[model samples]
Structure formats: structure tokens, C-alpha cells
Target: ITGGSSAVAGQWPWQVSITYEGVHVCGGSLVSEQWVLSAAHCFPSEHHKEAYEVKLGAHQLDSYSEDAKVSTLKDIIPHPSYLQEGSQGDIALLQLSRPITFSRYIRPISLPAAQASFPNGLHCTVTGWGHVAPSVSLLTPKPLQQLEVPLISRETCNSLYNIDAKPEEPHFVQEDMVCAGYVEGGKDACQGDSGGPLSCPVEGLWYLTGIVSWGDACGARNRPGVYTLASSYASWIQSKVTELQPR
Candidate 1:
């Protein structure tokens, strides 16, 4: 979440910092004691498995807290259908080297049901340790940032890109992706925010609805942030979770 405002500590316990060489590069959500959900684009190579670490229970990126838990990666499993070039199927799962203990500062977020529906215009929250500005060179915020954005309809989102493109041109938002943000654009996830969760509240609990994937620009008008729709790959997630269950 690349927002103008800073978030309070422990406000988003499920939010994890996906780091490369101790630098925050992306965001991820804890879906289980031993697993994290993120974007496939975050780990473009197998070498990332050894270089990356997941940090939980921390709001600030640069500070160290006694409550924070850092875990090394055991495996990095990107979606089999993921296409890095097109940013399609950008979801991924990470196995932690050891199971984490659940606490108020660290816990797992709930995933959407198999038939869950997040209709257009629904409000969602995205939290991450990404830069507040578009510049990659800018220092990522010390405290976590959060943005409240609404889900954009597929038709409206596609029309935004299709407006200036040729008929044969491909649409930015694909079947496996979902868009969320303001048409006027002001708040959105930016650099270093990829793989974060787009969580929507249903009833009382927040559900993981999307994974931050890509966008033309940060907070650009009519170019909302695109995410990997969690519901679309519910079965695949469950299958992997089961297959990797500790026996």
C-alpha cells in the first residue's frame, strides 16, 4: 500500500514484509502458520528463495522490534500458469522454514470462500511497506502504509485502456486479474508494494480478496491497481496447502 498516510502499529497483523537482502521489496499475507501468499512477480528467479525472507509483526520497515518475527524461505511456489511478461496469474505461495506462532502482532488472514464474490465498488484495504511516492529511489516509509480503495468493474477498467488502443490491442485487466482504485486516482499501491493483500471485510472478519500485481502507474487516473483475484484460484490454493501439509 503506497498511500500518503502512515498506519498504526499492529493495525495489519497479517501483512508481512517480503524482503530481498534485508530490503523491503514487496508485501505478502500470512495465510497459515507455515505459508505466505504473494505475487509471483516478486520472485522472478529461483535464487530469490535463498535471498528472500519474510518479516512479520512489524509496522516499520527499518526498525527492529522485539515482537517481530523473521523467517527464512523454504520454498517459493509461483502459480504454474503465471506469465511474467503479461503479468497474468501473478499469485504465489511461500513456505516458511519453520512454523510461526500466532499472536496479536502476528496472525493469518482469512481467505475467501470458493464462491466468494467481491462485486465492483466494494471497499478494500491494502497495507504494505512500499514507497509513498512513485520513485523507486525514494526511501520506503518506516511505518506501514494503508489505502482504502474501491473495486473497479472489469468492463470499466478495460474500457480505460481500450479507449486509446487499437481494436486488437490487449486489455490491461485480464480474466485472472481484478482492478481496484479511484478513476480520478489519488491513492494506490506503488513500487515495493507488489504481492500485498487486498482485503475486504465481510460480516466481521476481513477476507483476502486479491494480491497486488501490476499497474500502469502509481495512482494514475483511470489506471487502477491490478491484483490477482484470490477467489479465481481457490482450488489451486487449497490443493497446494493440502499437498504441503506437514505430516
Candidate 2:
């Protein structure tokens, strides 16, 4: 994100770091004591799951706290409908090797209801350890970065890309995805933010509305960050959680 500030410690307790080979690669949110919600694209194939680790209560990538908890992946279930090539249904759930104990610095975020609606132009916050700049090659390893952006209408977001253009053109925002950011750019989630939460405060309660998926270009003019709409998959998430519960 071009315009983001360092988040206060414990500001985003539900934010989790999804690591590959002990290196931060993507962001995720704790949806339960034993499950994390993230982007399917984070795991291109089942082989990638072997390298996945989830870090909780982390404010800085390089530093740790007594409250911090790290867990290995017990199972990774990418949405069966997820299409890696087309970037549709870009969501997944990861079962932690063990259940996490809730604390001030480690907790779960609330998911949106099936009929939840975050109208266009609604302000939301996105937090992660993603890169600070579009050209930056390194992730923000200090205090986690946070940005406040508004939701962009699907129509406006779709207009940014021409489907009729060359094969390399970006695909239009699909039904399952939500777009958010400024049309002028500057404030948005960048690389390393995939699978993170896009949260909005509603009537004093924060609801996870989106999960970082894909975008045309980070903070580019008219190009907002796209995310998997949480509400759209509420039933699927509930069903999966139930299926994975201990009998």
C-alpha cells in the first residue's frame, strides 16, 4: 500500500501470518479457535501445504511476544470451486494442528451474516505485513501496516479492465469478489496481503467482509484491491466448519 501507517500492537489480534518455509508470504484471519480463513491462491497445490505455518499474536514479523502462538497446519481445504487460473472463489480454510487459546493478543474475528451487506463507499480497514510500496521487494517486517479504504462498486471496478483486451488484461471482478480502495489509488493492500481480512465496523461490531484475493495492480489508478466476499460464502464456511468438528 502506498499510504499506510504502522498499526499499534494488538490492534489486529485476529490477523495471522501465513508463512512458507518460516517466511511471511500471506496474511489470514482467525475465524475460530482451530481454523483460519485465507485465500486459496496462497496454496497453489497440495504440495505447498507442507510448508505452511500460521503465526498468531504477531505485531512485527521479525519480533515475537510471550503471547504469540505459532501452529503447523493440520489440514488445508481450499474452496473446491476455487479456480487458480481464473481467480474465482479465491478462499480457503486452514485447520491448526492444535486449538488456540484466546487472549487479548489472540482471538477470532466475526464473520458476516449470509445477508450482510457492506454498501459501496463504506469505509473499511485492512491490516497486514504486506509491502509498503508497489516497487518494494521486501515485506514490512516492523509494526503491521494498516490502511483505511472505501468499498468500490463492482461496476466501477469492472470498468477498470477491458475483458475484450489482449489476453494479458486483468479479469473483471466476479460475483464472489468484493472490491475496495480509492479510485485515485494510494491506499490499498499490496503484495503479501493476500488472504487477509477486510473488516468494517457496523453498529459497534466489526465484521470480516472481505479476504484479499487478487487485483489488477496494487494501488494503481482506478484499480482497487479485490477480495473474496465473506458473506457470499457464509454457508459454505459454516458447512465446512461443521464437517470438520469433532464428533
Candidate 3:
């Protein structure tokens, strides 16, 4: 996250690093011992699942975890409905080669119920290892970063984006995409932060509410980070989770 602070180990138990060729590429939330929830766009080709690995229970990129440190993926199911960029259905689920053993520093996060609706101004936190600036600037050690941001209402968000063209034009903010951040700039999930969890606490536990999907420039005014509403695909997630049970 840009304008965010470093996160310590176990500060966010479910946050996992999705890496390609041993390099952090995106963030994810462990939903079960075998399943991980992430952005569909993160894995452009499911065929390359063998090339990716999920790392848990660690805060620093250069460090190691004490338990279940790394797990190869068995399969990745990107939403079949997902078509292209700027489209909805930007969510996916990947099954680990083997189920992970949960510990104090590693656990799973609960997903919101199907069709659940979140109120505007609901507090949420996004965690990732994104760049300090864009591509050129970076944080050494690449410690996990997190920032609390408010969920912006869709009506207000779309209107802010309405200035781009005529009202009749396609809406920039869609239904499945939820907005999170202040109307002003200075905080957001930056590049390399996609596929991460936008966790929101409710009742007594944290819920995987959103999957960081897209944004217009990192932390720019009126351009709050957009996420794939995890609740909207709750039914889809459950169905796939249950279906992909084989090792």
C-alpha cells in the first residue's frame, strides 16, 4: 500500500505473498488450508500455475516463515465470467498442492456471506508489498505494508468519475467493483499490490471483503483504489472451493 506503514509478522495472519519465480508479484488471503483468494488478473494464464508459489507466515520478503513456509499451487480457477480489463469478476481461487497447517502466524480469513452489502465509510485494511512509488522506487527488505481506508459509496464514486465524459457513457465504477479510500489522494494499494485482501472487521473477526483489483494511478485524488467485491462472488467461491477438493 502507498502511504502505508510496514506490517509485522502475525499483524495480518491471513495475508500471503503470491510469487512468480520466487519474486513477490501479488498478495492473497488464505481462505482455507488449501484455498487462497486473489485477483483473477494476477494469474493471466492458469497453465503457469506450476511457476507460482504461495508464502505465508512471513512479513519480510527476504525472510522465511517458521511453518508451512512455501506451497506450490495445485490449480487456479479464475472466474469464467471474467472477460477483459476494466470488466467485473476479477476474483479467483487457487488450491495449494497440499493443505497448509495453520498456526499462530498463519490462518484463514472468513469471506462475507453471499450478496452481503457493506455500508459506506466501513473501515477496511489492505496489505501488500507494493512499491513505495511506482516501479522505480521500492522499500528495502520489502516488508509487508498495510493501510486503513474507508469504503466509498458507489454513487459518489461514479459521479466523481463522471467528469471523464458524458453521463450516458459507460460507467467507470461498476457494481462488482467496490471503492475504498478518501475522496482526496495520498493512500492506496499501489503497483504489485493487486490480488491482496481488503480486510474489514465485523462482529468479532475479520472478513475477506474485497480483492484489490484496479486503480487510476497510485493514491491519486478522486481515484480511490478499486477492488473486486468478494461478497458478490461468495456463492461462486464456495462452489469452486467445494468442487476443487481433490489433491
Candidate 4:
């Protein structure tokens, strides 16, 4: 569970580092220079006015303040269909006020292939700055943790949550979403990990295949963490990014 080369722990750019009221709140992936994809839940609807600066490319938290450049957010586009109950469309994109200069520590993640599919049993990595234990310590965020969670079978996932959970529940493994984790789940995406990347390497490159969305609790054995499948929502993401570009 801990040792693996080419794992996501130190790979890619430090997608996103966020701060709210001087407290580091969440992390996200730099999918595009102007578009930082993350979870809508990271930003409370009421605090849209506060500055949500994104620090890209720096691995160490202090590197941003010491050596990295910061970009202020121009707008936050949470998925229009995002719902509280079902947690459907739990993704969001941050439009930067200006395009960034990509660097060794600040680069974008590759979008999943249009036909990419995360099959069951495949290993994927989830990284975040969430709580390492039940009780949080000081105000500062904990160090990042990376864990390996297998992609769960759609049937198995559906059976666990049951149909009664939500009538309008989008298929858990639909084209736009993916369900992953070990049924004996000691590893998973927790509350603070929302909007973090669920990445898997296909071929020789790492493509971001999922966005951490929700789960019942931290690594519950029967209840695994769920994510917004990138491939399933590829069309919507591409269309929206295209629309944001100047024609």
C-alpha cells in the first residue's frame, strides 16, 4: 500500500493549493492554464467573493510563497447539475484571471482519452492533504498522502449503495463517473480530498481519469469513495473549456 514507483505522490505539477481565511483548505488539478478543475464543495456558495488564489507547480507548500507564482481566480464554474443529496456533477472549474507560464512544477494533467475506460481491479492513485487521523491538530494542513485504491465493479458498487439510496442517482459507473476502491476499504478519498485528481497511467502517460467527489465516511469498509469520471464527462468538459476560449 505504501511502496510503488511512478505513483502519483510526487508526480505531475502540484495541481492546486488553496487557502481560505489563511487556512489551506483544498487541492485541485491544473487541467488547463486558465482552467483549474476541482470540487465545487471546496468553495462554499456564500464565499464566492473571497480570494481563492491557486498556487501551481510547487510541490512543497512553502515553495509557492517562496518561489512560485500565484494566479487569482476569475470565476468558479461548478457543474450546473451538481446536487447536494446525490452528489451528482460534483465537479468545478476555476477560470484564472490570466494564463499561466507552465513550468517544471506547474503543468497541466492530460485529459483521459475519449475512449478511456477504467475497468474493475485496475489500480489508481488518490492524493490529498486531508486529515491523516480522525482528529485534526493545528490549523495548518497535514502533509499530502497517497494511497492505492482499486476500481470497483459497477455491479458491486450499485449493490452496496442499493437502489433506495437515491431514485435519480446517475449510474455510479456511468460514462461521466467512475467508482473505485477496495471493498475492505481502509484506503479512500476523504472529506478534505474533494476535487483532488484520481489518476492512472495509460500507456506511457498519466491521464487524470477521475475527480474526487464524495463518500459516506473516511475509508468506510463497505462504502468506497466515488469520483466524477473524467471520460464520462469529457464532452461537457471540452465544450465548456472551448466556450471559455476566445473564438
Candidate 5:
């Protein structure tokens, strides 16, 4: 979040820090009592054999904080189509070793409904504990950062990326991907922000509308952040949860 302010405690209750081998790797959302939603790229093939842990209720990254729970990974499931580096299906669902107890600082974010429809220009908040600039830079104190951005339609996002391209060029954006950013570009997700939630307010609770996936520049003009559309994977999440966490 290059230009957004730091998030206050309890403001982002569902966000989690996904760590590999005890190191922070990416951000995620607690989509269920025992399920975490993150990006597939976070656990690439090379590191597929590595152990994973999830930090719940984490607000600061540098120091140990109270009210945070660390859970070992029960399973790591990345989408089958995520083999390609920049493919659109970049989502993954993780099962926690145990169910998390709900608390003032720990909660579950609602997954998008099957028919959840997102409109272009819709305002949403992206929260993370990753880099704070277009360059590889992390803000000191490592506080959870947040920025508000407008949801962009796939078509508009494709055009933005294909700017100055030939007319015969095929669109690179996929239907399962979502975009959120400004045309001028000031705020966006960076390296460590991947797999974080693109959170949207609903009737009362918040929904994990998108998962931070990829982008050309951190927050460059016409290079809005590409997110794995959570709405597109609602059924996948349900099926996986049922198959893997039926206990």
C-alpha cells in the first residue's frame, strides 16, 4: 500500500499472515473457521515441500503481538491451472491444523455468494503487511497497511494492459481475474502483499471479494493490481472445504 494509511487494530479482523518456515510470505483471509484463502503463487512448486503456518489476528509483523494464534497447515491446495507463472487462476485454499476460536481480533470473512455480482468502479479495501512502495520496500514497524481502490471490469482492465498494442492482439486478462486500482496509479499491492484479501463490505459482514494475485507494476498508471476473483471460486472453496474439512 504505497499511499494508504496504516490499518488500526481490529479494523481488519479476518486478515492473516501466511508464513513459510517461520517467515512471513504472504497475506490471506480467514474464509472459514478452519480454512484460509491465499494465492497459489505463495506456495510455488519449488517450495511445495516446505512447511507452512498461519498467523491469525496479526496487526504488526516485527514484534510478537498478543491475541495472535499460530496454526500449522493441515493442507495446501492451489488451483490446477496455476502452473503457469502469471496464469489467472492464482487462488489457493488452505486447511488449518485446528479451528480458530473467534475473538475480538480473530474472525472469519464471508466468501462471496455464488451469484455475487461486482460492479465496475465499486470501492473496496485491500489490506496487507507487505512492501509499501513500487520498489521492494517495507515500511518500518511493519504495521498492517490498507488502501481503498475501485473495482475494474475485466474488459476495462484488459484494455488498460493492452494499451498501445496491435488491434489483432488477444486479451491477456482472464474472466476469473479481477482488477482494482486507479488510472493514475498511487496505491496497490506489492511483493509480500500477494494472497491478501480484496475486501468488500456487504449487507453487514465483509466478503473476500478478491485475492491479491499479480500486476506489472506495484501501482503504475493503467497497471491495476490483478486479483484472483474470489466470487469465481466460491464453489471450488465449498467443494474443497467439504472434501477436506468434513470433520
Candidate 6:
């Protein structure tokens, strides 16, 4: 397992290791003391109201904090337009029944600057405990992997999808969205790390710019994963946090 802040590092900062039925399923990022942000698909069909638990402050898969705390699911608000099939708006926020104390090990990630746009072409880091390789491949197992990818232009991104080929179809690229990493298929978020952070450094501070959403395959050539453009969803996120925070 790649140790420390190299593989499963920056992006997973406010990240948590979520468990279901004694198995590690997915990851989540802390939005506030009382809420967490994650992919909507992680919720199981048969989970009782408080069946799940969020574990933080640990790197080893099987390891968990003895003082690890948990919160009951107070509410699960998925984006109104979230569609599972197309992977659009595949995001969700979890309101914990109680708030957690902010600490170095369990704190929220800093949001990117207002109207923040990472330097184009520079590599940003994505961290997670996602599957290193597809399926049950033991060689790569489920350790964290760090990937360096180049940021691409929206026009380039659109060209990759051919949606821009239609002059009338406004390129899906927007100010809130960013396209990074290699389009050729060696490294990228695989089965895990959904809802985890994609961050870049600006003026000595690391800011989150994206949330792993979905992709056609694990880093397929020219097929990069789509992320929830952090900028586009900033207001909604702020509103959600404010609404859930205790005064």
C-alpha cells in the first residue's frame, strides 16, 4: 500500500472510510461537523435508518479509530436532477444526527477560492482507497494510488466526447468544471474514491476542485472520469451546509 499523503492523500483529507455489511464500499468527504458529501449511489437498498457508519483518521483498510465516532443518518438529500444512468449529478450529502469535533484527523476540506480555476496544464492530485485495479485483482489490491494528470481545455474535452462536434450543442465544459489527468488510460480513480476530492495547490493552500463522479471505464484512453465541478455546485453546497449547521 502506498503510504502517507502520496497515494490516498490530499483528496481524501476530509475523507472517510465507509463500511456496509462488514465490507468497505466507498469514501466520503467531510463538508461540516454535521454533514458529509459523497456519491448518492453508495447508499444500500436495505439499510436501516442507522445501519451505516463513517470511519475517519485511519489509513489501513481494516484499521479504525477506537474512539471512532458515528452518526445516524438524519437525512439524505441527493441532487434533484441526479441520474444514475448517465452519471449526471451523481452526488449526495449526508446529514449526521450529531456533529463531530473538528480536528486535524477529522476536519473539513477547504473549498477552492471563489471563481477558482487551477492553472491549466498543471497536475493536480486525487487521493483515495479505491480499488487499485479493476475487480478483485490482488496485485493492485485496494491500496491508495496517486495519479498525476494534465488539465485540458473544455474544447479539447468536448472533442474527446464528440458532443461538441454538433455546433449547436453547447460544450458541456463550464467554468465550474475542470478536465485533468491523462486521457490515455494508465492512472485514474477506479472503483473507489467516488465523492472524494480532486485538489490543486494555490498560494500554499490546497483547494478542492472536483468530486469523482463517474466514467466509461477506469481511465480508458481518451475517456476521463466526469467530476462534479466544484465551482458549479459551490452555492448549492454552501446553502446545504448552512441549512444543516447549528447556529
Q: Please, what are the lDDT tens digits per residue for candidate 3 over residues 1-247?
A: 7888888778888999899987778889999998999998888864477889998887887765455379999988889978877678988898889888899888999999987777889999988887765554445667789989999876787776565545564546678888888777788888888899999988878998899988334776777888989988999988877776733
Report the candidate with higher lDDT, 3 versus 6: 3
Per-model TM-score on C-alpha atoms: 0.92, 0.94, 0.92, 0.82, 0.92, 0.78
Tens digits of lDDT, candidate 4, 103-183: 766788888766788778778787766554443421242335677777876568766656445566553543356777767
State in Å the error of residue 175, model 2: 0.2
Q: After superposition, how far is residue 245 of candidate 5 from its true place, in Å?
A: 1.7
Q: Candidate 4: lDDT over CA atoms?
A: 0.67
Q: Which window of ten consecutive residues has the lowest lDDT sum in model 6?
A: 1-10
Residue lDDT tens for model 5, 1-247: 6667789878898999999887788999997788899999998877743478899987887768888899998788998888776686799988888899989999988888767987888889998887777666675668899989889988898889787655774446688988898878877888788899999877776788999888334777777888888888988888888887685
Q: What is the C-alpha lDDT of each candidate?
A: 0.83, 0.84, 0.83, 0.67, 0.83, 0.61
* Candidate 6 per-residue C-alpha lDDT over 103-137 given as tens digits, one digit per residue, 9 for 90 to 100: 65677877764576777676666666776556522
Off by over 4 Å in 2: 137-141, 163-167
Where is the poorest 10-residue window by lDDT in model 1? Answer: 132-141
Off by over 4 Å in 6: 1-12, 44-49, 64-71, 137-143, 161-177
Best by TM-score: 2
Model 6 / residue 102 / CA error / Å = 2.6
For candidate 1, the lDDT comes to 0.83
Any residue pairs clashing in model 6, and if so which? Answer: 149-181, 183-222
Model 3 spans > 4 angstroms off: 163-171
Cand. 3 Cα-lDDT: 0.83
Off by over 4 Å in 4: 1-10, 62-67, 137-141, 162-175
